[PDB]
């Protein structure tokens with residue numbers, strides 16, 4: 001009842017929202033200063049950073065402290081269909097975002113601040129982000145269902161983590177092997193997931209796949225999740241790197257097959273990734289359609305390597321150096337990530353001769369795992385649907 005008191009804080013479990021109109025909701029966020037009120041606290045600003053929203057040309061506004069309390073509060077508006085992740089940035093600095101600002105001023109600003117990002121401690125839905133700070137989930141009421149995520153179930157057989165020591169790549173990484181449905185299942189499709197460490201540890205997919213397979217949305221299957229190791233490895237290995245996929249095919253999969261047998265049918269073999277991983281996943285089906293006949297690409301980085309020039313994959317597809325023949329593809333991108341959107345549309349245009357084998361999807365979200373988690377499940381559902 002009295003704002004900022006223990007009992008008041010008790011009633012707070014993350015942001016609260018209410019409809020403004022048909023299109024928008026108003027949303028309020030609270031952060032509690034561990035250090036107490038103005039007198040006792042060194043905190044000068046708290047920034048709310050919302051993925052795909054905070055980035056998109058006016059001056060950022062801080063949370064404001066309610067005078068005399070440990071409460072910081074900030075209100076904004078969000079689209080009814082929107083879902084995405086956010087973080088708080090409590091900082092002792094007062095120099096960032098003072099000017100009334102250039103697009104590059106903004107980016108620089110957030111670059112300086114993002115190292116101090118934290119998840120909302122009162123939001124139960126928080127995870128270690130992909131960018132070395134924790135984040136929290138926010139979903140507006142009309143955001144679409146994400147298959148399986150609302151009714152996770154304990155895995156029947158927990159995933160096995162092995163170390164894959166690659167002779168070709170001269171490195172070691174974690175691989176997680178997870179099998180679903182009935183043990184005796186024969187000719188189980190294989191799905192390979194890039195950024196495996198994220199989907200194995202940060203936002204574990206196990207209980208969601210379990211849930212969907214139990215209700216026969218997904219066939220019994222073998223999932224192989226590959227650790228990207230770190231940012232540098234990832235940026236070398238994922239974007240169009242033949243040696244990565246030759247190692248995967250010649251060393252990793254034959255190991256996985258003796259531990260967890262799966263089908264050698266390309267037409268049910270899935271390769272799934274996001275950004276560099278989506279690009280990688282397509283690159284794999286274009287060059288080894290005998291092994292990978294199904295591609296799940298979400299927010300694929302089709303601009304690669306050019307951070308106003310076509311990406312190399314698109315160029316090689318234009319030139320007929322590679323064909324998308326013998327492929328089923330889920331191709332997904334968010335509207336709140338405009339440059340990714342454009343690259344994906346350019347690819348889609350190019351894939352015209354193979355247009356009807358493509359599940360083309362747009363989304364009200366950004367470059368954000370909270371959005372991807374749904375499209376990942378739905379994409380696996382679409383690709384495997386002919387097995388039903």
Ligand code: NA
Nearest residue numbers: 149150151152
């Ligand atoms: Na639930």
